[PDB]
Structures are given as structure tokens and as C-alpha cells.
Design a protein around this nucleic acid. Sequence first.
RNA 1: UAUCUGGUUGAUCCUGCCAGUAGUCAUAUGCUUGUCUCAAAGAUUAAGCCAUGCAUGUCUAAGUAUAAGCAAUUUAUACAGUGAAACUGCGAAUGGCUCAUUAAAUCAGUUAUCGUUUAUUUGAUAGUUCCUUUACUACAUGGUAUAACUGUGGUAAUUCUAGA
RNA 2: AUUCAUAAUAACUUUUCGAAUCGCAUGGCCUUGUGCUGGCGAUGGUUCAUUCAAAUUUCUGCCCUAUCAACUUUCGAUGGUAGGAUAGUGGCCUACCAUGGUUUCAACGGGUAACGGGGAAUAAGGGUUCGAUUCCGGAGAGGGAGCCUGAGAAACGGCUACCACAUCCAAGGAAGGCAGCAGGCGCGCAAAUUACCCAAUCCUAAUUCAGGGAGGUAGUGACAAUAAAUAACGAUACAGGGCCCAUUCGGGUCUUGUAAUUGGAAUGAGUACAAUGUAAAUACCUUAACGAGGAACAAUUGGAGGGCAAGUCUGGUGCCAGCAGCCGCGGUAAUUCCAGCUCCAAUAGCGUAUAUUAAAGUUGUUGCAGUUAAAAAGCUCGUAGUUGAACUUUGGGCCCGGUUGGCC
RNA 3: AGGACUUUUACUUUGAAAAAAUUAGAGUGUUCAAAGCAGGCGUAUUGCUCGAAUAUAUUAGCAUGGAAUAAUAGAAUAGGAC
RNA 4: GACGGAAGGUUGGUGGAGUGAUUUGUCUGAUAACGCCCUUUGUACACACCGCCCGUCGCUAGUACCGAUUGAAUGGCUUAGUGAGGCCUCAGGAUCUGCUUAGAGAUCUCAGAGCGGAGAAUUUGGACAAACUUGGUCAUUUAGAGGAACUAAAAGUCGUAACAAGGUUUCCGUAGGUGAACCUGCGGAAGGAUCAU
Lengths: 260, 578, 185
Amino acid sequence: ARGPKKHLKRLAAPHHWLLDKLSGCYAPRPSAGPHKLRESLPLIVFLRNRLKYALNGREVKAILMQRHVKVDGKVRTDTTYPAGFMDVITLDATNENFRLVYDVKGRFAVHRITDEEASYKLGKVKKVQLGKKGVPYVVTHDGRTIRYPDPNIKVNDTVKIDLASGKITDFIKFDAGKLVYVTGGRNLGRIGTIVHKERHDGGFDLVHIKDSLDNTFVTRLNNVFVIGEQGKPYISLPKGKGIKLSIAEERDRRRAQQGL
Amino acid sequence: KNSRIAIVSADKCKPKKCRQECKRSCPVVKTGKLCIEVTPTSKIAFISEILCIGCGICVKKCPFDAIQIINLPTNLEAHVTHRYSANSFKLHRLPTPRPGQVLGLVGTNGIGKSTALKILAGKQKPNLGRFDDPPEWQEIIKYFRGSELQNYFTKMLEDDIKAIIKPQYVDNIPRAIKGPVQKVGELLKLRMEKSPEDVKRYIKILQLENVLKRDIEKLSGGELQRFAIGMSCVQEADVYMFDEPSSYLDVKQRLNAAQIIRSLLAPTKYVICVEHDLSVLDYLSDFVCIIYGVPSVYGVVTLPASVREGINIFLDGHIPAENLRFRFSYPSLKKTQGDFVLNVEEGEFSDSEILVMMGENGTGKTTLIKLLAGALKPDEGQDIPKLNVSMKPQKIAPKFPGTVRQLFFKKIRGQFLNPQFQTDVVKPLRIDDIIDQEVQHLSGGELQRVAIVLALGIPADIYLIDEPSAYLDSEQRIICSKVIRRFILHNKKTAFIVEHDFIMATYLADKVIVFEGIPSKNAHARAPESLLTGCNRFLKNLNVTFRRDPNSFRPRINKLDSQMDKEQKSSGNYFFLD
Amino acid sequence: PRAPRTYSKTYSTPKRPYESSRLDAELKLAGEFGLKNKKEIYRISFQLSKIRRAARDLLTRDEKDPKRLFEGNALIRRLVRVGVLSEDKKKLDYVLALKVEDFLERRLQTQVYKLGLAKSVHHARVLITQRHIAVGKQIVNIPSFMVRLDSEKHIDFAPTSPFGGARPGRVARRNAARKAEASGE
RNA sequence: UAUCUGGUUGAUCCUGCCAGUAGUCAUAUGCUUGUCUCAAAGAUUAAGCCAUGCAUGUCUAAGUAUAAGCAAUUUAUACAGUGAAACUGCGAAUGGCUCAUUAAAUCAGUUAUCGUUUAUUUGAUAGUUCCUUUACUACAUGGUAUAACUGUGGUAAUUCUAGA
RNA sequence: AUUCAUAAUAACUUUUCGAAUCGCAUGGCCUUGUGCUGGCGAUGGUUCAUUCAAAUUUCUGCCCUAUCAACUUUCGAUGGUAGGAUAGUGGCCUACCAUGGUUUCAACGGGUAACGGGGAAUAAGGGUUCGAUUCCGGAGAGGGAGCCUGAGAAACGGCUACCACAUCCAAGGAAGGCAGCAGGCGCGCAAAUUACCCAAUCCUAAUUCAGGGAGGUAGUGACAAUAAAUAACGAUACAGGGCCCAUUCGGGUCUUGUAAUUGGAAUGAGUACAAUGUAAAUACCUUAACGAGGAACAAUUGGAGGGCAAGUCUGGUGCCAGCAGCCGCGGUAAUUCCAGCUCCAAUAGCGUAUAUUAAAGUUGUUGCAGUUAAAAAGCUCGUAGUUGAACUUUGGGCCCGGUUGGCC
RNA sequence: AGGACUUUUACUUUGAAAAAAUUAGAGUGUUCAAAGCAGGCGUAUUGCUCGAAUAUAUUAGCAUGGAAUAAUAGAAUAGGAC
RNA sequence: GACGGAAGGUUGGUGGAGUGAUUUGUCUGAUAACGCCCUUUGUACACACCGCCCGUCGCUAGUACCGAUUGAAUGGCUUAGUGAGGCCUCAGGAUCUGCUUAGAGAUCUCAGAGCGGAGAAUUUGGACAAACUUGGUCAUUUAGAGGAACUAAAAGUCGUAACAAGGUUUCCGUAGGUGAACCUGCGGAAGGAUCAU
Ligand SMILES: Nc1ncnc2c1ncn2[C@@H]1O[C@H](COP(=O)(O)OP(=O)(O)NP(=O)(O)O)[C@@H](O)[C@H]1O
Ligand SMILES: Nc1ncnc2c1ncn2[C@@H]1O[C@H](COP(=O)(O)OP(=O)(O)NP(=O)(O)O)[C@@H](O)[C@H]1O
Ligand code: SF4
Ligand code: SF4
Ligand SMILES: [Mg+2]
């Protein structure tokens, strides 16, 4: 209707922000940013709902406007800034560090990380082309272009990004024998290393994946994003380890064993 | 709840072409009584008033949309903000004291306006047509919640909106408060708080410079109305009210009064005028707010309109809500008092004829009348009245406890017994309530009408009449004036009529004497000449002109200087179409 | 406008309103347990109905099915914690059987009578609806409740109001002060 | 919670309706009306008409402020405390409202743009313009106006505006 | 998959960009001059990607109607050529050339009390009806048409004209739109206050400090729902079971009901100190001080022939008035009318209309009927449509080997 | 990496792709319940802590086994497979 | 059962025959039975031929349709003619503002002229296109002179056409006639009073 939509209601926003139906009509529309609208998570949502630091929007703004907190080690003062997958949220509150990584149920958990891990992040290369004056370049899932890459780095691979500098510290190739995370959709927040790839002419390369318990499954390659070598993940994984328990194991562990 | 009624005439409301469906499909026509009377003919469809039940069935299936549907005024125990007891006046809506703009409040006389103003002020509190218990504010708030006044009234409860009103009547304010010292001087200083400069601006722009050394009691009601407004104005307060400010005052001095009222309005303050106006309400208010009903029975206030539009609807009648119809000799005497030189010229005071006076307030028209009756004077010579003298007072705030009927026994009802007082008023607006009921509780035009009777009441011919337009409007004024003229022309009398109103003078007038001179200095009464030249003399000095409203014959004062105004100044004529 | 607060009615009226068998039998329950209306009975039979149809839907599928197991165990365990179904028949086929009488037994109106102290069930209801009695620290004022098995032994009079302790009341205030003590001037 | 029951015959069994029966986030309407929680509410005739008021404006350490403003600069005869007004830049295309038209059109799921625009965020990004880079005009960084403003008015009038 | 990314030549430009911008702390240097360098930002800045999207677009599906069987082709119909036009492909539009495209597997027309979905009502299963309405998408802000400005509009709380309504008026002109909030009139069987407030949830801005009837908060609210007070306990007089220790002739817990006979006990509804609640209040939740024993603080709404539960009780009326969804009641004994007594249903909620779902296996695919009850077309041919014989590798083993249950 | 061709379908298991709200439904202290997604737990003195599942989602489009049922064919002028 | 202007001359018990109504027993003149009257058939009657019921005619109320009106109003579509308004262009140049040979006395208008730039009205021709005017065209509710029907009838007026061989067996199709049921030809059927020489 005659241009961009600036407002956004509750309900229209995704289920994995854990937005309660009541206590408001509207939701925070994520601002135009690196990540997409539906996949990403606003900073306000990360603060008041998850971490429980702020109560109101006021308080959130008052926290953000005094610098302190920063995504990618950069000021980032806007309220509804889209913090997406695999982002370092550096805070000065008792030297606390946070990595956004997916959970069992496809949400963003409060997963703390070490001060050494805060240095670097990862990124799935979406295209690699020549820019102006024949200079090749890559582009990650979060738009962080890197000039003068290694010729080994082709499409669908992962890059380790240094944050402090826009550089390629490492790269990992796309095949079996590597630890392989999976985002997007039904099998969102799982790990199973790849068994084998499938070509399919005319788009959509369904990859076959096999977790630690050998409960194999298939997902689409656009939502697949690797991580590291077998038994050597370059990022510290959360509780659950990208396995996904059935409802039986849930009723055994999460409402029987854990009780006092 | 209401009386729905049909209305007919239109642009090519064609009965000849249509095959008259109105007649053909009306329920009242098809059960005996002819409500809608029509044929294949040259005229319009005629439809009755009294018969029409309402329905609106003819409206839907008339082939042209000629016939509309209206709703007539009637009480239905709806709303009711206050009554007194029973077989008495009631009122339904008091409303939005809308701020930042002056609020006009218009109606035919004895309709509730004053009572509503009092209610708004919080002096005479409402009762919802019931006999309430000790301070029941709660209940009344609950009744008029869901609306603006909830806030207003609650504020009033904790006096965070201080009250002030200009009273209806003028003669009561000097008599009630017997001050230690008179003049403008000290009594104004005790009243005012605001500042030193604003008061200077007020008294200066009020063009008085007269009554700075003089006691209030001596002051004529006009210079006195002026004081009343001044005392209301300077008083430091949140709310502001002016209950009929522009009565018996000069045409020039009305406009600047209005523009001093205007002074108070802007910065988050509420103002509420009442007025029976010509077209000087153009400047008084921004939001005109008409009230309708029956005099001294029920009154309903319509939601506010724009001033222009509102005045224009008051004339025709119908509105977006309802429909209120609407439409021998004397010598040159030299008279003095203390701070005045009231001279008079010789004149021809003819038999079986009227005589018209005009002038600025303080031109000496009024004391003349007193001296003619009996008060003081003369030091050299006079002419005693041949006929028995008949007198009209201006300062009317009387006190005859008991009832008006008792006071009517001091006159007589059995003279020229054929209508007289009934021809003044009896069928449309009614006099039953006015003939009963106390005079203490009676309102302006009705109280004034009390004095209009005290004139053609005692046996007398030679008549002294100054300011009958006091507390009356276009409805009550014109017919009353016509009746007065019919009286004194038919049965052979002589009367010295004195008006501030233009229509009440010019529709009567023939011989016109003109007062001239500055207040609290001089006064010269010029001889009776033609109606045109005399009126020019009256208005050349005042420096204001009129415009006859072409459709309805109605006066509209000009805006000090303008394109038409200057033509009138250069030509001379201030009255078209005799 | 925001999202709606959802709602759905708990009572479910019978098909045939005038029937000699149903009206006589159902009113006995109402007289025994002390139920004010037939609405309460219908509510209880509606909850029971939902449980029944759920059980039927579980049973149409095969044994050793992920859907049938989990849901069965939770349904059964819900019916156990409230105390309607005892420990002997924890089989899922037995929840289809059941009856309305057990449900009304498990209501807090009559569990006060089944404990004792309140003499009559009607008296117990009165006690409950007049702010007396409590599950533990938490006070309860509603006849219908469903006591959750563990809660049974903790049911007693509340700290506020008499029997438990605190002040006497209104009538006793008037007898002690306005009548007994007020005789002496 | 996979249910029927009275009505045609003198009595029967049928076809076959009629009426009963329960529900309704489908409405109205009658009577009655104490409490708690929760709540749709000018759609249906009429996307028929509307008094009047209000609903989109906008400032930081950081674009322009000799307001002939306020309180004073106590580092300021360059302003360099605060700051109405106006200029500039953004916003006003989001929202909220209603459903009249509209039948392969909208629409849903589902692809595609290797037929494209994309303000703004987000990340990268033009050392080669005095094309006589031999004097060429200043690059210690230059010109054209013009609102607010002071004052003179026009019109009956509108958030009308004229000169100087 | 490319005439792609990209590069390199021959070119043109009527000229895109390459900061003449602004603020904080003020240093580090040099043969020492208002000299050379200098950090932390903000806002601009062309291209490329990214984001927000936008625009077109593939396939597949939609309510009734043949008393709507041929439509589209004129000044666009289907296709091709070449241009113009667009951010763009493209009959989108030009000039030329060709004669196509749709269709009874139902086009084209007509109707729709038709915005489309997500859904709702009902439910054995299958279905049938509704979806203006809290979310997504579309369209329009009286009717049409055109356009400025911006990245974005064909915008309407922007403009422009004409049409229809309609306002101020000095007649000279000037200003209009609520299908935003709250209201007023109309039409109505039918619907609420011209209330408070940005504290929430968001949004906009040069932006933590402003603004926002976006929204939220009260009121009006029997549209719908949830819980759920409308009275419990004894004593005395009645027809009783008869129980506790069983020392069968000791006195009263439980009582089944009927009794204005009576004695205390517990409360709310309601009034309100205070506090909480809240932007600020009203409520709620609390709780001092108060507030049950009868016209008290009283509950009704429909029925009482059958269907359908409850009356052959009492008086009036006398096929009259009336009841009656249906059958039928009423002509002087009415178990149906009018009242009253008593009883039954549901019970702060019931009745009455109209629409609709189920029952209706009275639309039937699951699942109807067609000898005589309505229904088999006079009979045959025959195109579409529907359906259409069988037959084209089973068996045998050899191991490997997971899942069931019991001795192990 | 591949080039070359395997008559095509319908049918059907599995898988993704499958906006929330609603629908059925797991835990929970709205005092029960309609609801809501809260809540439990400490020496309740500077803390600990599970969870917001799961399925439903016809048709249409994809990838995926399977070869039964139902169609569809290469070769009788053999310009026919090796 | 009752009736016929059709043909011939009492009741349970138990048991069968039937889903029953009921029948058989309680019968041709032996044996599903054991211990005016009748039978069979026809029947639209079942207060039972005085039975039902069909129509011409009079009478209250409605209901559609037809329709005098060369009704009237409102809509979409359109022949022909006219077409504002912005937008795009061919022109136009009120005015403002730079440069310069050149005017004036040692970033000075005083003469003008050229070289330009910005540029309001007005303006030729285009595409867009709201409207307006004429012929209509179809559709829609909407009027309502009077017609021709149909119903709803509290039990009228003339008839018997059907239900018994309804006293002319009954209908179908058509043709003709008739005030009225209908009647009369032709061919067919029997849901005929004949399942048979
Ligand atoms: N206290 C009272 N007792 C009895 N009657 C009263 C009282 N106050 C007013 N009235 C009547 O109410 C009517 C209207 O009162 P009010 O508002 O004063 O008139 P009004 O319309 O102001 N007249 P005016 O100002 O002259 O136009 C009068 O006719 C009185 O008769
Ligand atoms: N004793 C006195 N001393 C001084 N002045 C007096 C005295 N008595 C009366 N006056 C004033 O002298 C003036 C004479 O004018 P007057 O005739 O009253 O004018 P008017 O007709 O009343 N006009 P208006 O005021 O419009 O009614 C009045 O205004 C009186 O107030
Ligand atoms: S009003 Fe309508 S109907 Fe009555 S006459 Fe005029 S036109 Fe014919
Ligand atoms: S209005 Fe009602 S009454 Fe008056 S005319 Fe039309 S129909 Fe007859
Ligand atoms: Mg008055």
C-alpha cells in the first residue's frame, strides 16, 4: 500500500520471539539491517524478555543510549536493531559476553561465551563475484563483504570473521566429515555433520544430515550452515548440543529426573 | 420522544407530472382524515401539520424527493438538568464551555439562558428535576459523566476554577453592596488584582474618562452597564461570564465592549456570553449556541455552531437536529445637576403623534424624562403636562413580595378591555406563567414586559418611554413595537419613545429629535426634523453605518472602516429601502 | 485492536429436556452432593465427555505409538493426581468407563463432609462460600474445586475467621458487647 | 455427545411431509436483574449526509540563531549559558477506518525476475577534476540570494498576503 | 544455461561523483612559525552487495444460472516484424504483415442481500451453512478523471478541474469533505461517552528528555462467556430407624420428613478510616468502624389434555371472549380460556421472532426412491462424457539380519 | 568429473516447503474455572532454576522409495536392437 | 363393516396363517385346526346413500399476471456532436541578472548596443479525460384505469359428471360441440363387472 510498512502488530511477528499475546497490540518491527525480518531478533526483545534486565522500552533505551552494550563491538544505539544468527553482543555489565545461537526449539537462548570467543564470529558465504576493477569479494549472511578473499572460498562455505578487522582468519569447505549446524524451518537448531549432498537442477539442494544418535534427516541447503571439523566445533555450542530429544525423553528428563 | 412531521415544497416538486403517490400511499389519507391534500393541478402538494403522525412512508415512495421529514419541539422527560418543582420551568442541556473562544448563547426571552449561566457558575446548582438531599454533587456528576462537564464540575468542587458572573440586572449591584467609597477610584482597586497596566488599558479603551471622580448611584444605567462589565472584567478569575452585557448602550460603545470581552479569551480560559443581538454578536463570540423551547415551560440547548452560520439559522428556523420556527409644545430649558450641562431647544410636540429620541449614552435623553414627570427643576420656566403623565423606568430590579397578580391589582384589567395585553402576547409565546408567578424570579424580557404594561394601564395619554429593547430580541421586539404604535396612533395619544436599537426606532419613527455633546460635560437636544437627516446626525457623530440584509430586511453593522463603509461616509445615507 | 481473549462454554445441555429417567436420577445427585443447579452436573459431564472422547481417539490408533503413549500417560496421571481414578486401573481402557459420582466426590464441597467436622454437606458448602476453610495457607471460597490428592491432609480451617483463631465475628460482638456487657451501665 | 416424538384411519402398515426437539462468537425483542472475572458493541437498510473540536509532527555534545527574548556570559567586540520564531533536513505513502465495486480479477499455497526500482540501515567503497595538472582565479577555503525580522498597508472573510 | 560478473580498446556527455559541512578534547612534533602533522565522532557522498520492500509472473482451486450456445475481431481481437513508452519484460502503444484465440471436460452473457483467505457454527463418519468483523492480502476515502512533490502516491486529515450536494457573503469572491476518535441527523428491528492519558505496547522525528483518540485507561454494555450469594445449625411437639458401652428398665451424638413454636452462630450484598491499585483516579484484592431473623437484604421466566415433566383442584365465562407452533379445546358440570390454590421445568436468568446447523438416509459419494405411493423419458441410432476380457517372472533356496515375548 | 540414452503418466510410503491467532493438546498456584504463559527454589543477606512443547495443516507445486492395480509402447513397408 | 338400480343360495382358551389391522376355528356338502340371513366379489362411504363429492351461478377479502397510460423516475451501454482541466511538447517573452569591444571626469549607474543565463502570463499541436447535449438501447424498482384467472369460503342457486354394471363401465390421446358438470365421434388402455370352452 503505497510504500514500506513501518508498523508491525503482535501475531504477525514470528513465534520464536516468545511474545505474549496480551500486554500490547503491537510488536517491535526489526529495523532495516544485516539479517532478515523474520529470522532475526531485536535488541529490545533480547533485553526485556530474555535477560530480564529492563522492564519497559524506556529502560531499554536508557541502557542502549549510554553505549555500554554493543553488537559486533560497535555503538548500535537504535532500539529495534536486528541481532540475528551468530552475533556477538558485547556488554560492559561485569564484562558479560553473549552469542546468539539457536536452541532445540528454534529460539535464541541466553548463551554466554568466553572473552576469547568474543573476538571472532562466523558467516555463510552467499555469493562470490568480481567487484569493480576486477577485485573478487565474498558476502556473508549478514552483508559483511570481505575484499580480496582466498580463491578456495566458493559458494555455500563458511568464513571465520575477526570483527575488529573485516578479514578472513579461516575458511571451512562444504562436505561430510565436518560439524554442520542447521538453521531454518522444521529442523532448525540441529547438528549432524552431513552424510551426502544432492544436486537437483533448477534450485533446491536437499542435504542429508545424521546427528550423534544416527537419527538422520534432510533439509534444504539455504537453511544449512556448517560450523567446524568433526569433534572440533569453532563456536561453543549451547545445552542440548543440536540433537533434539523426542517427547518421551523430554518427559523422562524435563519433568521427572530434574525434580527435587 | 419527538414529533415527526412532513414538509413539502421543492424545486420542481411537480404534482402534475408525478401521478401523486403521496396521496396514494399515506396511511392517514387511507383512514378518513385528509392529511395530504393534492390533485393534478398548477399549485404544490399541500400537507397538514397537526394530523401527520410521523411514519415517513410518503417520503420513501414519493417519485421525486420533494417531501422531506422534520421533527418538532416537545418535552419528553429526556435529559432534564433542572426544574423548580412542577407547573414551572425546566431545562435539559447545559453545555461545552468550550475554551479559547467566546461562546454565544441565543434564544427568545425567558428560555433558561440566565439559569444555565448561574448553573455553570456553580451558584444556583442543578437538581435533575428532583428534590435533592444536602450537597449531592456526586449524583449530578454521574448523570453528566461521559461528557466534558464531568471534569469541569469536579474542578469546581475543589475551587480550582474560581467563579465570576456579570449579573442579569443592573440596579441591584449598587444597592446590595453599599461600599465605603464610590467612584471608579478605590472600589475598582479593591476589585482588581491582575496588574496595573491592563486596568488602565480597559478603562482607557472603554472611552469613558468620565466617571473617575463620580459615585455609581448617580450614573445612568448605560454608563452603569459599562461599570458592571468593568467590575466583572478586572476581577482576577479562572472562569468568565457576561449575562446580557450589551443592553441599553450606544451602537459605537457596544463594539468596543465586545472587543474588551474578547481580551480575556485566549490563553486556556473559558468565556460564556448571552445576548439578544442585531449583528454585533459577530464580534462577541466565536461559537454561537442556540436554545429553543417554550417560554417558561421547557428549554433545550442545541450543540454550538459557527457565529455566521448560527445567526443565519436563527432567522429561517430549521437546523441540523430539530426545527424551531421563528420566521403640543415645549420651551428651551437649561438644566444642570453638578458635573453636567443639559441644555434643551424649543420644539413642536404635536397631537396624536409619536416622537423619536436617539443619542449617545450621557446625551441627556433620560433625565429630561424625570424632570418632565417630577423630581427637581426649574430655576426659570416650564410647560406642565396637559394629559396625565405616564412614566417608564430603565433601572428595573423591583421588589413586591407575594406575586405579580397582586401587583397587577394596582393597575386595572377592564379599560380598552378588547385584547391590548393579549395582542402583545397570548397565543404563540404565552402569558399565563408571566401573569402568575413571582416578579422576584421572573427574567429579562418578561420583567420588561411587566413595565410595558405599566404604561397603558393607569389612565394616561402623554407617555415617557426609554429603553424597552432592554432584555428583548427580534422576536419579542418587533411585534411589541408594532403593538405600541397601534396603541398610540389609533386612540389618540402622544409618546416620547427613546431607543438604542435601530429596527425598534426606524420601523416606528416619523419625527426625530437628536441628542448631541460629550458625556459629563454638555448636552444639546436638536429640534425634530426628517427621519433621514436626524438619523444621519445621530450616526455622523458616532461614526458607524449599517447594511440592510437584502433577503430578510435586517440591520448589520459595518466593520469600522471598509469598502461599503467609506461609500456611506461619502454619500451620507445609513438606511436603504424606506 | 489487539488479539482476542479466547473463551468457550463449560456446560453442555442435554438433547431431550423432558425425560422421566434422566430428571429423577440426576436430581438425586444434586440433593446428595448439594448442587444448586443442573448446570454444575452438566459441566462435570462435559469435562468427563471430553476425557472420554479423548480416550477413544487415543484407542483408535495402535499400541506402542508415540501419540498414544505420551498422551495416555499424562491423561491418566492427571486423573490420578485429582484422585478420580485410583491406582489399580491405570490402563487407559478404564478411563473410558468412569462415572460422574466420582467427580462429585472429588469436589471440595463434599471433601469437607467426607473429612468431617462440617456435619452436613449443605453446611460444608455454606462454610466454603462464606470464606471459611483453606487448602493450606491459601484460602478457598468456592464449592467446586477438585482437591489434588496431596492437598487432602492439609484441609482445615483458615487462620483468619473463627475455629482456626482470631476474632469472634459480628453476632458474637453484638452479644458480648451490645447485650451482655451493656446490661451494666 | 451414531437417539427421536405427535398430526392424515373406524383400526393397520407404508410413501410423505407438517409440527415438536437441542445448538448458534446470528441478530433483534419481552420480562426479570445482587456479586466476581472477562468482554464484542452504526457491518446488515445507508461507501447516505454531517454542526463542532480533536487525530502528524519533529532536536541532540553535533546544520543555520546579534529575537530589539530569558538569565546572564565572569573562556569570549568573532556567537560559543538557554532558546520562541523562521530556513534547511526528515516525517506526513506507516497507522486507523470501512467493504461499495470485484468471479479467474482479488485471493491462498507455490515458483521466477539470467525482464527490474529499492529512501533508510548494514559492510565495503573514487589519493589521476586548476584536462595547458608553463602562472590559473584564493583553497588559510570564495559568490548569488532570501525567510524570520523593523516598518508602510491592502480585503467582509480562510493557517489570503503586497510592496520597502 | 547467458551477449553474466568483469576487463580492454574507439567514443560522446547537453555534464553524475570526488565533503567550500559541523561538534568534543586539545595535544605530538620540528633550526620555533598563528608552522608540519594530530584523535573521538556526527551528518553528507557515487557504485556494488545487504536489508525493507515494491512491481510484474508460473502452475493449481473458487457462489448460482442455460428461459445465457456461440463469443472475441469497429477505434487491439490472437500471433509475428520493427520501433516508441516504461525502473522495467510484454498489444502496453504505434506502422506493416498474418488470420487467428476461446469454447457444452461448459466459453461469452446475467445474477449474487460476493472483498479473498487464515477461520466460525454444527459435529459419529462423510458433510451443510456463515465468514462486514481483532491476523495476511486487496480496494476506496461523495462520484469520476488528471497531476505536483518524494525513494515511495496517482495519495485524498496533498492539489487540480467537471458532476451531485452544501457553507460564509459587503454579491465582489472565499472555503468544503468523519467509510480516523467522540458525537448530531437520516434510515432504521437493530449498536455505547463531543470522557481521561501517553505510564504501558509500539511508531515518527535532526531523536534516551517531543508528538501520537496508533493505542491504552475509565464509563455506557443481559452481544457472548467463567465462577457463583438468593440462607446454614440446634432446641421443643409429632409418625419413626432405632444407635454408643451390649450390666436387656441409663441419657443424648446421626437423624427421614412435618410443624412463623424457639436459641444462639457464621457471613456476605451494602456503607466506609486506612492502605493498595493506578499517568491520575473508579473498581478488584485487603480490612479498622458498621451491616440478617421476615412486606426483612422477598427471583423470577414459561408451562400443568397429548407430544413434554407436572392438576380430571377451586370459582367465572358458555362456540362467545379467547387459548392453540401441531393435533384440537369453548353450545352453561372446560384436567386446554379468565383468575386463584398447589405442582413442574430452567434458575440471575428464561420466553418470543426471523436465519441457520443437527435430527433430514426429506439430497442420499459413504447413503434415498422410481410395478401400483412423485417419478423409467414411444422406441432406436449416435458424437462428447463415463466405464471396458484375460494375458507379458512366480516359486525354490543360501546366507546376513533388526523387531516381539519366556526359561538363560 | 562426466557424456549417452533408459515409453510416459496417474497411484501410494517418507521427507521437506509449509505465518501466527484459532483448532486438539504437555506442565503450571488465574484461590478452582473461563483464561494466561507464567512459575518453582534458596541460610527466601547481594543467588539458583526447568519451560513457552507436540501434532493438525485436504487440494496445487517439489524431492523420495515402491512396483500391484489403470492407462500409455517400442518391431512386420523391419530407413529395427547388438 | 356399510352400501350396490352387483352375482348365487354370538364369543373367547390353545394352536396355526400374518410385520400388523385381523383371520382361521365360528367350514365345500370333509377338515389347520382341537376341544330377512349368508357367501363371494366393487367401493373415493366409515356420523356409513339421507352417504361422499364434481362444476355453472350470486356473495366478502385478498393474490399475482395482463395493462389504458404513444406512465414516470432511476441506472449501465452507446450513434452523432461538444468537450473543461492539468501533463507533454511547437512558440512567447512582462520581468530579474552576468559579460563585453564601449560611455564619464584617474568591485562609478552616467549613451546604448551586442554576448548570454534565469524566466510569469499567454500560446500551436498532441496523448490523457471528468463532464455536457442529442438519438436511443437494455435493465430496474416504481405508479395503477380496468381486465382474465386463482384462492379463502360457517353448512346458498341450479344441476348429477365421478366413487357400486353411480344406474350411458371408467379413463387416456386428440377433433368437434356444449351455459354447467361434460357429451359425441376415431384409436388405445384397463388401475373394468371377464386372469375360463
Ligand atoms: N427561581 C425561580 N423560580 C421560579 N421560576 C423561575 C426561577 N428562575 C427562573 N424561572 C423561570 O424560568 C424562565 C427562564 O429563566 P431565565 O434563564 O432567567 O430567562 P432568560 O431566557 O435568561 N430571559 P432573558 O435573559 O430575558 O432572555 C423565566 O421565564 C422564569 O419565569
Ligand atoms: N447628581 C448628579 N451629578 C452628576 N451627574 C448626574 C447626576 N445625576 C445624574 N447624572 C448623570 O447625568 C447623565 C445624563 O444623561 P442621561 O439622560 O441619564 O443619559 P441616558 O439617556 O441615560 N443614555 P444611556 O446611559 O444610554 O441610557 C446621566 O448619565 C446620569 O448618570
Ligand atoms: S410530493 Fe411527490 S407526490 Fe406529493 S405531489 Fe409533489 S410529487 Fe407528486
Ligand atoms: S408523514 Fe406519515 S403522516 Fe405525514 S404524510 Fe407522510 S405519511 Fe401521512
Ligand atoms: Mg434572563
